[PDB]
Each structure stands twice: as C-alpha cells, then as structure tokens.
C-alpha cells in the first residue's frame, strides 16, 4: 500500500555532493496504487495484457497511479567540519495515488 | 518522453465484455518524466543507487514523476447488435508528470 516510508541514511548517499557522516531521516513515498485505478486504468491495462497496443517510443506506459510525495520538508545534518547544513524539499511528509 | 500515444484498437480488447468489429481510438499517456524531477528525486536515486535504502515492502519506489492522464474523453462504438454505446471517461485527453 503507497504510504511514507521512513530511514535512516547517511548524508553522504544523499547525492548533494555532501561528506559526511551523520544518520539523518529521509522519507519517501512508495506502494501499490493499484485500488486507484479507474475505468481508463482498467483499459490500458487490458490492452496491454493482450498486446492490443504498440509499444509507444520510449518507456513502457504505466496503468495506475504512482506513489508520490505531495508535501515536503528541509532536510538538516552535521557535516564532516561538525557544521550545520540544511538542503530543502528534502525528505516527503505525505502521499498519495 | 511524456507525451499523449493514440491508437487503433478493437473494441473487444478494451476488456468491457463486448465484442465488436469496430476499431477506435484509445488515446494513452507515456513517457519519460527523469526531466521534471525534484530535488527529493535526485536524493532518493542515489540513495536506492547506494543501496543505502532497504527495499520497502512491496513495489520499489519510482525515482520521478509518472506519465499520466489528466483528463479523459468517452470512446464510443458498433456493438454486435450495431447499436451505438458509449463509455465516458475511456479515453485520455491530456498527459502530465
């Protein structure tokens, strides 16, 4: 079920081109959204499982909602100088289908 | 990339319990969205990257927006019978990440 994970992680994994070792928290967002699906939802799908449709150019299309962060919040840590940081929109606070 | 893919399909793969010789379009999103990622997407990559995220239960979590319908249109068509119907909503209109 999509709903807000949460972790601990160290900042140095966080990608911002950070060194540090400090175990802040990070959430996200992750789930089946499968029960959000609608009448359109249920169709492609169908399509699909027949291979009623030609793959469109690219990536695969996906028939139901995806997990997603709809809030968010700053994410603060320690660096390796023992200084404060804080990067925005970090981590989710909320999801949704 | 996300963009709005139309078809031809019979109506008889649209899973609708209706068999039909008449082929209509089917309008689908789809695409690549790694464009309108968030900073908490990037975050999150690298984390699942590093494996320094453990697997939720269930489906992993997309690292970005999903290609989807943000508004819908009815398809409509023969029956068997030659008797005109319609399904509102089947149909997709628009795309969005």
Chains 1, 2 share one sequence.
Request: hydrophobic share 30%; net charge positive.
């Amino acid at each position: 079920g999509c709903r807000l994970r949460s972790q601990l992680v160290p900042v140095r994994a966080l990608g911002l081109g950070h060194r540090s070792d400090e175990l802040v928290r990070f959430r996200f967002c992750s789930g089946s959204c499968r029960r959000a699906r609608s009448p359109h939802d249920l169709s492609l799908a169908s399509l699909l499982g027949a291979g009623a449709l030609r793959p469109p150019p690219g990536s695969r299309p996906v028939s139901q909602p995806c997990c997603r962060p709809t809030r968010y919040e700053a994410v603060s840590f320690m660096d390796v100088n023992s200084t404060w940081r804080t990067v925005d929109r970090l981590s989710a606070t909320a999801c949704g289908c």
